[model samples]
Target chain A: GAMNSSNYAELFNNDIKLFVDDTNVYRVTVHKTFEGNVATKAINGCIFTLNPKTGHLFLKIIHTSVWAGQKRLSQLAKWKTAEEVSALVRSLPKEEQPKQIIVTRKAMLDPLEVHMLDFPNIAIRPTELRLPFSAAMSIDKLSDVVMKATEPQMVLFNIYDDWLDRISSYTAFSRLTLLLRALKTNEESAKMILLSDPTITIKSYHLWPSFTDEQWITIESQMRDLILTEYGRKYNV
Target chain B: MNTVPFTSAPIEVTIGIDQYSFNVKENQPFHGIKDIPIGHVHVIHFQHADNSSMRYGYWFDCRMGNFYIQYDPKDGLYKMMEERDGAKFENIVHNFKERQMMVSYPKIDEDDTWYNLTEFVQMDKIRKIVRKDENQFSYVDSSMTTVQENELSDPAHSLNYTVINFKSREAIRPGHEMEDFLDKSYYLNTVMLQGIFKNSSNYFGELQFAFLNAMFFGNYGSSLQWHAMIELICSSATVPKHMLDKLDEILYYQIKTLPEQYSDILLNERVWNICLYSSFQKNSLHNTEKIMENKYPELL
Candidate 1:
């Protein structure tokens, strides 16, 4: 099985300790001697002074060897809590050091912190879709639940066209716009939810080749009408 | 003329105070232990003839023949006045016994073969003549030999090529660094064609393997035609399902035909990503699902 936070906490709880200093700085002390040119120090710890409002940590006084100190600091940065951070530090001896150390708030939080800020009402869980258990769940049912519960003011459509043939043709483009606008609407207001506000925008991710201005104008005219009729919104090519 | 017996032992000949030793054979030329000093005056004389002696001021090898420099009374400068018909002047000395002669001076009645040596040997100290063959030679800088050797053995050759190969594949995915090395496409194409594709017999399979190699190995780079070909192949609507069905066979073929250095590209996440992505894009994921699951269960 895969190692989780609980397993790490059980393994490393004894080897490291975490506490707050009188100045409100978070300190992580590892039970290992730090050998330096100045002297051999005991109960050496790393000081993490976080910004009051932003929660951004500024590391200070790494008392262990450079590699071990960084490893412990990464654990502290990732786990946040004393017990979990200690477990992460204990697991460091076996774990390979990453080429780059990227410490972010999103990494520390279970659900991405940025997405949580954007949609506070809905819970966002990032899972691998290729997993058997996750893949078994109905994606359409889940999307429906989120759509109904949030009742978003605007809905952005994510369309896939492998060959870009469907996107380039005016007939196909017009038909898709007509179908989406007709189907998706707010229950109480009966207002079209898709492209209804300036906040929501329609975009495509595909292997789109360079197109002439005339070719763009043909399909863009329909896109402009679709956005304008919803709420007098603007469109970008 | 007298014939000498073939023997492995050295034949010692005393000429004045100096003694010369030569390894003599029956039909082959005699090998001399001492080297003849080039670009210096030498007074040569045959042991049998007292009056047959020539004063050669200088000598050098040339494409035409071995030239001996002689001082001309008219010009008052040393010129290549005597031209001998032979590949090497050293070999002439070895065959001295067979010819029964040492230095053959040009007859007075013959056409003038005198050419000024100053025209060939320039005053510039930087340039030196390097002979590619007996008949071919070119002037190169004296310091070029050291620089050329260093360039051939430098570690940057392999290191730089590997980086270029990776950037070429990364360019195919949406990014910058496409214009970093303008000639990177031509360079990588040439390298791939010579290194991997040269030995393969299957022309169609070779092109498919080239694409597969680019995705998995990142050995091939982005070129004008390469980008279009990959985009076309990746589209499910463009390619027929029948051709997509043979993706497993093509994948195995590419793996088997890869060079020894690139053998590590298989059975890894890099290869798995490309294999799964290619199949997913081509609408043939179900065809290779079993193989992919077997090889990479974690990823599946």
Candidate 2:
């Protein structure tokens, strides 16, 4: 699963072992900082390294019990505050993830190490959910989506006035607060998560069309360039 | 394909003047083969494409057709799977097919959308969409007791749809891959597989058997839909039950009209799923020796 930690020493330093059960310890550090290049670049000095996302703050490993460990870690999202979250995040080193990460009140994510960036499967990255950009489904995805909508149960109807009209899974939706994005409906980046592949922000409107990746990038970069530029002003609070 | 075909070892490939192992890329695909039963399965559409023109638009996966297999079968065969300085994927396809194995393609067209995601599509319409394909049929285990309507974006396609089936052979494709995929102990395991024995008896009584090695019949579109649909089936109990009831309906209708269709091959029938334990047994398990033993496990 995901090995959420604060540093690389954990790879062999199973003392603070997030996941223990096997041949090797896979420690994935979290990094949310913007300028930790010096520490991050030192990734090659030790252990294993992997490509990650910009502003990344999470790492993963298949070190046997990793799935179980991540299951426990993911639960933290339920009760832990920003600090505890930050603490567990930066537990590994660049040897495992990024050398140094810094997450501020604004998207505060920092990892101990950073590996080369690989497309799609950054394999490891600090960027987790891209809020409004990313939506987690605890239950029925479409229904969960509707709940996130400004209006849930707002009588979905079709052209035939069929109130029974439901959302087509093919029709992907996003949580866009254009008003928050500080742009007129006409503004280019009205809503977008840029620099992110597969998806930009949490909603990853980039993946709007679902599983088809080709159609996604056909216009994704252009779409994201504008959107990512606008997101901070709205909710980076 | 339900049956993940494996060779005595990995598929061997040696091409051109230099000689590169086809197993290079081959092993990676096979790596994820065995996990089908216990893990989630997605149709891993691997295409030989150049994303140079576009940023990353060459991927199309509607069926969420996740065919999860062994974690890293490619370890043994990467020389042949990597990007050559200048070799087309078609080069790979011709060889794979020659070996009697369906070569996986990485690029999916826009029409491929219907297969990538199982957001619930209407069956009658899906058939109309995939009409050009030689064979067309929508399968569902419609036993609602185990299924959830909320699961089907278009349950209607899975049910209440008419399909024309001609010259069909309904046997599982026990390809070369089957041997390696089933080598794990009858307990928790590896590979990125996605299936559940929780839905059936016999062969499907185990996780790998249920999801990964269950069935294989479709055009590219239907096959994709099969994958998208299974993604939903693995996670939500709702879809599983939906499938159960759907299968029940199929059986009900077939049994109801059995005499009319095949009076000579007359056979009494019973539809059993994992939920109906009293009418079935659990000791049933499958390996290379026995397969699909529980697909039609009988119990009144």
Candidate 3:
């Protein structure tokens, strides 16, 4: 009944298209006429359906023209129509659906400002994009990506060589043991140790004869691949 | 006092401690001492046959327990007198029974006065002298602990007094008095008034306190505080070998517990250089040198 208003009719008259599939899926498409350098017109669509069991509307981006270009999906024609559709659903005085809406978008997986659009009584559920899993992931690329993702934790790995070079004295061996212990038992403390300026923290003449050559070799090998592989497992890379 | 024939040639004295080599030039003062702990009484008086003419000088190590004596003979130079035993001979002790001692030769004066070696030096009189009964004399030796306590309790014998006087005489530099006041405040709060050093015989405990004070309150970067700590450490006659061995661990613990601002001071070049050169273990020295090299590569 609320969709019969003049405002709804005016919006529908302006290049708006609606279709329903056999599976009870409703698709709303809105077209924008633009006089740009590369494109003159574009189409955006929102696919949503009212769930009979839960009495909730689940909405998702079917297609957006701005996504095809460098512009963000928030500026798409579908978002404008989606807000209008949600309001129309809210205005319907029906007991079947209680105006609760769920918005799902793949752009939510990373940094994108799609949720900022005014959607009252709407919950944004981020969706992940499934890509083909490649067994040949480069260690260097994995390190770089994970490092970029976790800067604080990766700083220790990045500065390990330089720190060792700067402290080549007997204390370096002891500090290496300390670093290895911290890496195994406590990651946060390892970060603290790495962040601390080695010039001041490692400036001791105390010899650690207890740290044998065998132990050093073992820990060196163990910690060498610990960071990358651990982060790779965490990120499912 | 019984007078002994004085000889001027350099005489050999056998002693357990390190010996001092004297090369006295004409009209120059010859001052020397060895192995005497700081705060120990050291006085030198010179008297010749002349009743009215006399030259006397008293010397004492301010904080470091090592003994020092200087005599500027207005006329010419004189060598240390020879004796049977090296300890008594080195100090030129005249009569231990009568509590009389003299070193160097001077014109004898009717009224013997021991002049202060430095104007800042102050001598405290014996508090109460009671005549000893000859009948009650015993051969058993008494512990010097009570005497040492009396001496340390005297304000004149304090490290605070010695440092203040030394700094004052060295000339008033900017912030010198303020620094002295701050050190004195720290000393009073932690050491003197706290009665940590009350049981003077607990040498190891005293040494531990000294180490704690140096690590926590000595303001490691300050040269004056650093000097005081060095003197304090050197003044001890017996520094437990285990303490020296554990110094590395102690320093590490200190660095770990203190805040970053304070801990950073321990790594200061000057402060760390002292640690490297201190009477610590050989391993500690090697490790410390490596640390210094890493921190200040240009200094190497």
C-alpha TM-score for every candidate: 0.18, 0.18, 0.18
TM-score-sorted candidate list, best first: 1, 2, 3
Q: Model 2 residue B191 lDDT?
A: 14
Candidate 2 at A94: error in angstroms?
Answer: 25
Clashing pairs in model 1, backbone N/Cα/C closer than 3 A: none
The reply for model 2, stretches above 4 Å from the true place, is A1-237, B1-127, B131-221, B237-243, B247-300
Model 1 over residues B208-283: C-alpha lDDT tens digits? 4223323322432212122333333333233335445444445443334334454343334443555466523534
Residue-by-residue lDDT tens digits, candidate 3, B116-164: 1111122221111111222111010011112223442433322221221
lDDT of 2 by residue, A1-237 (tens): 223334422333222222101111222345556666432111100011111111111221122232343444332221122222233434545344333222211211211111111111222223222222111111122223333433212211111111113322112121122221223322334333222355433332222223234544444445555555545556783
Tell me the native contact fraction for each prediction: 0.00, 0.00, 0.00
User: What is the overall TM-score of model 3 with all chains considered together?
Assistant: 0.18
What's the lDDT of the predicted structure labeled candidate 3?
A: 0.31
Q: DockQ of candidates 1 onward, in order? A: 0.02, 0.01, 0.01
Per-residue error (Å), model 2, residue A31:
31
